[PDB]
Amino acid sequence: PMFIVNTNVPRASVPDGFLSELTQQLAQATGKPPQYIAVHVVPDQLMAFGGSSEPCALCSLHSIGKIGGAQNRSYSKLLCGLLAERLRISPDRVYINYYDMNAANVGWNNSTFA
Amino acid sequence: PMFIVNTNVPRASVPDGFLSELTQQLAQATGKPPQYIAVHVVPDQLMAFGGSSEPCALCSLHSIGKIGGAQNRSYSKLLCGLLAERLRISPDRVYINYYDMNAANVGWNNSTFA
Amino acid sequence: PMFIVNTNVPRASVPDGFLSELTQQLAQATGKPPQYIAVHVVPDQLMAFGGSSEPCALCSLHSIGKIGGAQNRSYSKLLCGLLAERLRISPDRVYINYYDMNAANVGWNNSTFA
């Protein structure tokens, strides 16, 4: 998994340990080793959700498989959970776009995963 | 709709009002309640288009359906129009990537839209 | 092609001419005129790869065609190569998501490419 969070929450509100926590929890959730997982948090963004500038997040999760109805519902519960607990963002002010990438369409280490 | 604009125009050149305007215009254009609409503007970016650092924008619009030939042509007119009028970006220096998301592949409120 | 790189490398470490070099090299790789090529570099990011905050990058390449097994392998070698040489990022700490966009789903100059 690679997970990207873009939020209007300020940098000083992202707690120490957050990228490590995301990494571990995504490892646990996907049954994938943590060495594969990438995470990225972009705070201080100029964003709105429903025309409001209260805390919100626009996120992406990309995986090579392990994407599907049930799996995505569990990922959304985990990730909204974390964003609510650590960043004080309401789950109904979060979108997470999920992408099932073909191995041939993911570059890594001078080649692809195909 | 959720609309993201990345641009090398400076923060101070983004009008107060712009996120609200995008939200309202997007609501009009899609017929979606504005409560569902998210917008995000990212100024000051290190970017080039055609090798030039003249104002430009890289954007995305994600929707659950309501994406297709005619619809995307109308969105591109609307959104290039706004970026030209408000951020003084030439329409020929804008890209908009459109994504028709499956409901099961959009997380929100601890679950998905499926 | 449009290429976006997000990295925890600091802005001061991005050398002069980097966006110009990406443009020119992407033109060469895809055969496409540099005039349509967009590039975007986002340094100083809060990111981790494999649970580690060593230099890393998460990137995307969108093209209307010119995406496929061998092409993307070639692009990955090219781009990981530039990121290593210029930003001192190890190739094994780079992910590049490739997107073959339908021409109907790419907005430019008030319309789409369909």
Q: Which two tokens stand for residue A36?
A: 């594969």
Let me know if A112 is exposed, middle or buried by CB neighbors in 10 A (0-12, 13-18, 19+): buried
**A89 backbone φψ class: left, alpha, beta (φ>0; ψ -120 to 50):** beta
Q: Counting beta carbons within 10 angstroms of the beta carbon of residue A16, is it exposed (0 to 12), middle (13 to 18) or buried (19 or more)? A: exposed
**DSSP annotation string for B19-31:** HHHHHHHHHHHH-
Integer Cα distance of C101 and A90 in angstroms:
33
Q: Report the alpha-carbon distance of residue C40 to residue C56 in Å, rounded.
A: 16
Positions at the binding site of C:
32, 64, 97
**Residues of chain A contacting C, Cβ within 8 Å:** 2, 4, 11, 14, 19-20, 23-24, 34-43, 62, 99, 101, 104-112, 114
Going by DSSP bridges, is the β-strand pair C57-63/B94-100 parallel, antiparallel, or unpaired?
unpaired
Closest CB to B72: pick one of C19, C37, C105.
Answer: C105
Structural domains of chain C ordered from first start: 2-114 (3.30.429.10)
C-chain residues near B60 (CB < 8 A)? none
Pairing of strands C46-49, B57-63: unpaired
What does the block give as tokens for A1? Answer: 């998994």
- Give me the amino acid identity at C16: D
DSSP at C14: S
Approach to solving = X-ray
Q: Which of B98, B93, B86, B15 is nearest to B57 (CA)?
A: B93
- What residues contact residue B4 under an 8 Å CB cut-off, 6+ apart? A6, A58, B39, B40, B41, B42, B59, B60, B61
Q: Scanning the structure block, which residue is given the tokens 């706004």?
A: B82
How distant is the Cα of B26 from the closest Cα of chain C, in angstroms?
Answer: 15
Cβ separation of C51 and A62 shorter than 8 Å? no
